[PDB]
Every structure is written in C-alpha cells, then in structure tokens.
From a paper:
Here, the ribityl moiety of 5-OP-RU is stabilized by polar interactions with mouse [name] residues, namely R9, R94, Y152, and Q153. Both M2A and [name] mouse [name] TRAV1+ CDR3α-Y95 formed a network of hydrogen bonds, the “interaction triad”, with the 2′-OH group of the ribityl tail of 5-OP-RU and Y52 of the [name] α1-helix, known to be essential for [name] activation. As anticipated, given the identical germline-encoded amino acid sequence, the relative contributions of the α- and β-chain of the [name] [name] were approximately equivalent to that of M2A [name]. In both mouse [name] [name]-[name]-5-OP-RU ternary complexes, the TRBV13-2+ CDR2β Y50 residue forms hydrogen bonds with [name]-R61, and van der Waals (vdw) contacts with [name]-L65, while the CDR2β S54 residue binds [name]-R41. In common with the M2A [name], the CDR3β loop of the [name] [name] binds the same mouse [name] residues, T72, H148, and E149 with the exception of the [name] [name] also contacting [name]-N146 and Y152. To examine how mouse TCRs can bind to [name], we have analyzed two mouse [name]-5-OP-RU reactive [name] TCRs; one from TRAV1 transgenic mice (paired with endogenous Vβ chain) and the other from WT mice, identified in the context of chronic H. pylori infection, named M2A and [name], respectively. The affinity data revealed that these mouse [name] TCRs exhibit high affinity for the cognate mouse [name]-5-OP-RU (M2A: KD ∼1.79 μM; [name]: KD ∼0.45 μM) yet have a markedly lower affinity for human [name]-5-OP-RU (by ∼13-fold for M2A: 24.2 μM; by ∼12-fold for [name]: 5.59 μM), and the dissociation of the complex is slower than for mouse [name]-5-OP-RU.
The [name] cell population is characterized by the expression of a semi-invariant αβ T cell receptor ([name]) where the α-chain is composed of TRAV1-2+TRAJ33/12/20+ in humans and of orthologous TRAV1+ TRAJ33+ in mice. Central to [name]-[name]–mediated immunity is the recognition of the riboflavin-biosynthesis metabolite, 5-OP-RU, displayed by [name] to a [name] on [name] cells.
Residue numbers in the entry:
A (entry chain B): -3 to 95
B (entry chain A): 2 to 192, 196 to 270
C (entry chain C): 3 to 124, 129 to 137, 139 to 149, 152 to 162, 167 to 174, 180 to 191
D (entry chain D): 3 to 225, 227 to 242
The structure:
C-alpha cells in the first residue's frame, strides 16, 4: 500500500586516482516495501560483480541496502546504478560524478 | 548514547532476496544478529558476537525465534482479513531500549502495517496506542493480558538494558574504536566550487565548519551526509561556492574526535 | 538455581505462606503452580513486578532485589492441601522449576477424643481415631500409617496392623 | 483439555515405550517433563510447532516427535530403569515471558528387569468396632489392599452403587510391605459412616481397588496373568 521512493547515492570508497583501482558504492535508502532490484552499470553494460549487503531496517520503517563493486576509474568510463522498485513504474538510474 | 534494537519482518510473498520472515537485531546502529526463514538459524553479524556468546545462546534463541516466525506470520494473516487485503503486505516490528547519557533509560515497542504505524506500546501506562479501527481491536485484545503487559514492561525497563551493556562491553574494541579521517580538498569549475572531503574515519561524527579569509565563517555551503564506505568507515564532503571576483582565501577546519585540522583551499 | 522449602503446617482457616527464592541469570517472570498429590499441577498466579497481586483468594508478593516471592494462601481448607511449585524464567527463557513445598493443613477438632478401637474383620486392624499436635509414628517393623482427615454432612485417624493397646514407639497422647 | 495416554505403563528393561499427548487447547507449545522425588520438574523435549521438536535439560534416552498440532509423543527407544517417573504433558499459551502451562494427568511409568515381580493386590475390608458405635455413635470402616507391586493402584469406595467421597480418607502414598528390593506395597483407606447407616442391613458397602499392571500384549509363561484388573471385597451392614 504505502510506497516510498528510494534515495540513490553513488560515490567512491577511496578518493579516485584515475587508473588506480577503487570500489564505487551505490547506497540505496528510504525504500518500502522491502523488495527491490538494484543493478550497477559501466558505460551502459551491466556490471556482473555487484555485491549487495543484507537488507537493513531503519527506525522510520524504511530499509537501506548498500551495493558496491570493484572498479578502475579512468577519464572516460562512466558508471551508473539502476534501481527498480515498486514505488516507481520505471527503473531509476543515477550516474556517478567524480566531483 | 547507545541503543539496542530488534526488528521483525513478515511479508506476504517470499519473492527473492526478501524471505517470508526476517528478524535482525542492532546495537548502536550496528548489526549483531540475524534470522530468516531461509536459514532458520540465528547467526552473528559481527565477530564480537560469536566470540563472546557460547553456542547455547545461539541454540536456544533460535528455538524461540522459530516460535516467533510462526507467530509473526499469523498476525499478518490476521490483519489482511480485517482489511480484506490480498497480494503483498508488509508487517513490521521494532522493539528495544537505549541507555542515554545522564543515565536515563527508555523503552519502546511498536508495530507497523504496510510501512505506516499500526500499534504502539506504552510501558509507563501499560496500554497500547491504536492507529485505526482494526488496530483498536488488537488493543482491546492485547490489553486483556495483564501478565503479558507487565512482562514486557519488565523487559523494556529492566532486562533489555542488561543486554545492551552486556553487548557494548563485548565489542568495545569495535564500537569504541577511533580512526582519524583522511582529508583532501579538490576544485570544481563552474559552468569556483571548493570541496572539503573526508574518508575513512569512525565515529560517524565530524564537523567541517568551512571558513573564509582569516576569521570569518562562510555562510553559503553544501552538505552530504555520512555515507558508509562499506568497510566500517564513513565519508563526507562539503562544497562552498567562492565569490566570482573577491580573491578571499578559504580554509576547511575539520575537527574529529578532538583533533582539528586546517587546510588550504584551491 | 531455584531453592524452595519442602514442608509447611497451618491451621484450618488462618493462612499460610509458601516461599520461593531464585538465583537465575536473569528474570522474566515468576509463576506459581499447585499440585494436589498425583494430580496435574494447576496454574496459580504469575508475578514479574514488585507489587503483590491481590486476587482475594490469595496474593503473591515479589522482591526483585532481595530475590524471593511468597504466596499468601488464606482461608485454608482440605482442598488447600497440596505441594506448590514455583518456576522462574531465565534471561534466555528457560523454566527453572523448584522442588516444591508440601503445605499440610491441620484439622481443627473441637472435641479431641483420643480413642483406639479394635476393628473387626470380614485379622484385627487397629484404628486410632478422633484425636492436632498428636504426631503418630511408624515403628516395630511388623505397620503404622500417618494421620488423615475426612468429612461429614472432620475426624482424624491412624490405621495400623500385639494388640491395639501395645503402646508402639509413636509418642501417644 | 490436555490428556495423556497411556495413563500407566509397566515395561521391561530394553523395550519400546511411546507416551503420547493430546490437546484440545489450540496451543502450538507442548512440553515433556518428568517429576522425580527430590529435584523438581525437569524438561525433556518440547515443540514450538508442528514438526518443530527440540531437546531439553534431560534428552538422555528419550526421543520425541510432533506429527500434528495436537499430538506430541515421547518415544523411549530403549527403556531402562531410572527412566521410571511421573511424566507430565503441558501445553503453553505463546505469551513469551508470561506462560501459563496447562499440565495433563500424570503418567506413571515403571521399568522392571524381570516382569515376574508384578503383583496384583489382595483386598480386605474390615467391619466396624462395636465400641466405636457405642462411643463415637459412628462406625469407621477400613479397607486394606496389600501385596501389590508396582504402586499403580487407585482405591475407591462404592456404597450401594454410588462412589462415596464423604468420609473416604485413602492414604496418599503407599508403603512397602517388605522394605527391601522388590518390596511389594500396601495402602490403607478408611471410611467412617454414621452408626445408623451401618445398622441398616440394606446398605451395601464396597472397597474397589483398580490395579494397572501388565498389558495384554506381553509375554507371560509362568503358570498367573496378572493384567489390569479391578479387585474388591464387599461388606453389608449388620445390627
Ligand atoms: C537474539 C538475542 C535475538 N533476539 C531477538 C529478540 N530478543 C528480544 C525478545 O525477547 C523480545 O523481542 C520478545 O520478548 C518480545 O515479546 N527480539 C526480536 O524481535 N528478534 C530477535 O532476533
């Protein structure tokens, strides 16, 4: 019945030195009902090494889960995180910006 | 402050990565225990749990948890009847106690149906707070057990805290650990944005009052919450917008666990 | 972990207090049960807070710190003749059952008439009847049973099977 | 509410004994205990639901299963002495810390090395004493059941077809006739009627002793067949 839209937040574990390996996290938060589908992307391809965490509970009855993968940042390759949730009629995609 | 919580999850559909029943416990916003219909065994979620708890605690507290799995699946099948509901519906539970500073303790026990609050327990009035008509029927039935309500008031007030203190001392090496931050500052070009960045610290608490010139705090800023790195450490960033033509200098002033640092701003 | 006395005497009417002291790891509640000599135990009361549960028929007071509880049985009778079992709950929800206190109720007799008769056969048993400080004893390695009480529309007895007035090792009075 | 079957059992050392329990109470918690002289009730096996059998403080030699929601059975694969006690079956309202156990009627199990020792009782009933009638103005009858082993007996009086409970004062625990080894037991019940009741020769008095002993499906070569039987000794009034 009640559905809450997630909060995708894509970032990197350690400050990127392009050409040096890293792990870029996709920290999905504030979603309910608990069932969700999360997939991370590299230049449009589906990253096949996405390791999710166990689903966690929050005091506001929402859930949060952190999916990551090892990646080698460059000056061209882009990374995103696609999430399909019952709150949305289409999957939502958030790209990673170095900032 | 510190807090100990135990959650429960009953859902109408065992669709993958979300079992039919889930129950996880959290100490100070950290996972410790876990149970679900897939494993049917309470397992530790931290190294300082399987080491300081003998096999009997895990053995007997699954025998209880399986009893709670059926009880919790039954209560969900009860609410779906009163709303004539079908399909998927989520039934949640949150219970626990937090030992604050100043010594004052609290207790809480509340339920939730489809995310929204369903019924809330009041230990100091020995009464349940209903949210709708269906939740009121539950109140008029749970309240009819004076033995039950007194037992819970005992657990929240008296026995839960004993678990919290017992759990804090076990993982004192991890829960009271101090890791200093890694602070770097970067520059972003406007289409003049200076970022102060911190990675790999642990307490999840940091102050990044971003200054200006010599002794004037900069009003306008941006903030990002303490996003978890995933190895146990946390990170943050905060970006001022420098004035287009002012030529005033900037600094960062990161303070963390009683060690302030001052940085340059290119 | 739970220690409980094993004997208790009181006068019909009056009242009695069976006790229960626990040393469990934690505490989630204390329950009282009554078992009537080969019948199944019957739930009596549950206490987890500090106060006493005034049920009129009985009461049960608890002490969290001192670590004990007592059951205030009142208005005693023949029905209130049983052993009493207390059970405390562990921090991991394990029932720790005490041994039990046998509360024997004394029959108040308004005409104590110590009389021993030689019963016939239908073999000469002896029936010390209608004597409650008169404590009987089993001896001689023959055959003396213990005291018991009956009802009417209230008299004691002591069956045993020398002659009736053999003055056995029991402290007769 | 909660019942147990069999109510009594006498089995040989190294036998198959199955003690089952049934609950009309729609509870999902059922426990098995054994109450022994000295230390109190000690849990053996229980269940939190159908097919959810777990163990307890004393799972030695016992195994349990729960086929349905209203059946939890204690299975003694290899029976042994010192497995003999009173087994109580309890149901539990799933109230968590609060728990009102509903115990069923006890089960007296006895394991014997040789079955020859099982002895049915011999019932004798003793007419009143004339001095008591003259003095008390009431007549105290006495029934003695002796020579029974094991102690799985229950004494009851039957006056003129009615099981009287007015003055019946059966001894609670039997006593061993020969306090050594097998030590056949004996119990003594007493009924005290008014003098007028005994004086009428139309009132019929009876002392019934029910003895639970060897099950029919057991081997008995000697001679003789001391199976469960009701044994009695009647008595009529006399002026
Ligand atoms: C192992 C420590 C897991 N415990 C656990 C609990 N424990 C508290 C439990 O006693 C109360 O929830 C209960 O008494 C309330 O009636 N609770 C829980 O919900 N989940 C757990 O895994």
């Amino acid at each position: 019945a009640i559905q809450k839209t997630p909060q995708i937040q894509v970032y990197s574990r350690h400050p990127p030195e392009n050409g040096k390996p890293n792990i870029l996290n996709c920290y999905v938060t504030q979603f309910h009902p608990p069932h969700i589908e999360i997939q991370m992307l590299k230049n449009g391809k589906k990253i096949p090494k996405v390791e999710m965490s166990d689903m966690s509970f929050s005091k506001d009855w929402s859930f949060y889960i952190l999916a990551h993968t090892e990646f080698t940042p460059t000056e061209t390759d882009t990374y995103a995180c696609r999430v399909k949730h019952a709150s949305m009629a289409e999957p939502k995609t958030v790209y990673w910006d170095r900032d | 402050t510190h807090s100990l919580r135990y959650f429960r999850l009953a859902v109408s559909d065992p669709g993958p990565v979300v079992p039919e029943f889930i129950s996880v416990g959290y100490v100070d916003s950290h996972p410790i225990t876990t149970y679900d219909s897939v494993t049917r065994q309470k397992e530790p979620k931290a190294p300082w749990m399987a080491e300081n708890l003998a096999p009997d605690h895990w053995e007997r507290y699954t025998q209880l948890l399986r009893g709670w799995q059926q009880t919790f699946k039954a209560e969900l099948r009860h609410l779906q009847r009163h709303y004539n509901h079908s399909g998927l519906h989520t039934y949640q539970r949150m219970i626990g106690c937090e030992l604050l500073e100043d010594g004052s303790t609290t207790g809480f026990l509340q339920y939730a149906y489809d995310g929204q609050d369903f019924i809330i327990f009041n230990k100091d009035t020995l009464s349940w707070l209903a949210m709708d008509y269906v939740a009121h029927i539950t109140k008029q039935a749970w309240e009819a057990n004076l033995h039950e309500l007194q037992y819970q008031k005992n657990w929240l007030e008296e026995e839960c805290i004993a678990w919290l203190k017992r759990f804090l001392e076990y993982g004192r090496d991890t829960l009271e650990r101090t890791e200093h931050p890694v602070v770097r500052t970067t520059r972003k070009e406007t289409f003049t944005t200076f970022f102060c960045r911190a990675h790999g610290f642990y307490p999840p608490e940091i102050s990044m009052t971003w200054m200006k010139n010599g002794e004037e705090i900069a009003q306008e800023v941006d903030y990002g919450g303490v996003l978890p790195s995933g190895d146990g450490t946390y990170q943050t960033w905060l970006s001022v917008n420098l004035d287009p033509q002012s030529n005033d200098v900037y600094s960062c002033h990161v303070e963390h666990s009683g060690r302030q640092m001052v940085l340059e701003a290119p | 972990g739970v220690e409980q006395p094993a004997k208790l005497m009181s006068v019909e009417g009056t009242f009695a207090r069976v006790n229960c002291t626990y040393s469990t790891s934690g505490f989630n509640g204390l329950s009282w049960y009554q078992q009537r000599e080969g019948q199944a135990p019957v739930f009596l009361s549950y206490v987890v807070l500090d106060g006493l549960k005034d049920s009129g028929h009985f009461s049960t007071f608890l002490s969290r710190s001192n670590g004990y509880s007592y059951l205030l049985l009142t208005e005693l009778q023949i029905k209130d003749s049983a052993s009493y079992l207390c059970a405390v709950r562990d921090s991991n929800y394990q029932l720790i059952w005490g041994s039990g206190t046998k509360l024997i109720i004394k029959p108040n007799i308004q005409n104590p008439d110590p009389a021993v008769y030689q019963l016939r056969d239908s073999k000469s048993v002896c029936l010390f009847t209608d004597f409650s400080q008169t404590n009987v004893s089993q001896s001689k390695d023959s055959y003396i049973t213990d005291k018991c009480v009956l009802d009417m529309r209230k008299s004691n007895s002591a069956v045993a099977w020398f002659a009736c007035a053999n003055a056995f090792n029991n402290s007769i009075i | 509410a909660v019942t147990q079957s069999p109510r009594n059992k006498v089995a040989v050392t190294g036998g198959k004994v199955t003690l089952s329990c049934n609950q009309t109470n729609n509870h999902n918690n059922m426990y098995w205990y054994r109450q022994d002289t000295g230390h109190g009730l000690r849990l053996i096996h229980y269940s939190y639901g159908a097919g959810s059998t777990e163990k307890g403080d004393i799972p030695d030699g016992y195994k349990a299963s729960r086929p349905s929601q209203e059946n939890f059975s204690l299975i003694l694969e290899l029976a042994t002495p010192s497995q003999t006690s009173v087994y109580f079956c309890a149901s539990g309202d799933n109230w968590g810390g609060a728990e009102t156990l509903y115990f069923g009627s006890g089960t007296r199990l006895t394991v014997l090395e040789d079955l020859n020792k099982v002895f049915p009782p011999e019932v004798a009933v003793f007419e009143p004493s004339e001095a008591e009638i003259s003095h008390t103005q009431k007549a105290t009858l006495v029934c003695l059941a002796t020579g029974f082993f094991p102690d799985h007996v229950e004494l009851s009086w039957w006056v003129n077809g009615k099981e009287v409970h007015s003055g019946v004062c059966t001894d609670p625990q039997p006593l061993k006739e020969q306090p050594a080894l097998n030590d056949s037991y004996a119990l003594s019940s007493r009924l005290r009627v008014s003098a007028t009741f005994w004086q009428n020769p139309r009132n019929h008095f009876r002392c019934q002793v029910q003895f639970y002993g060897l099950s029919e499906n057991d081997e008995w070569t000697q001679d003789a067949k001391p199976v469960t039987q009701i044994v009695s000794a009647e008595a009529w009034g006399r002026a």
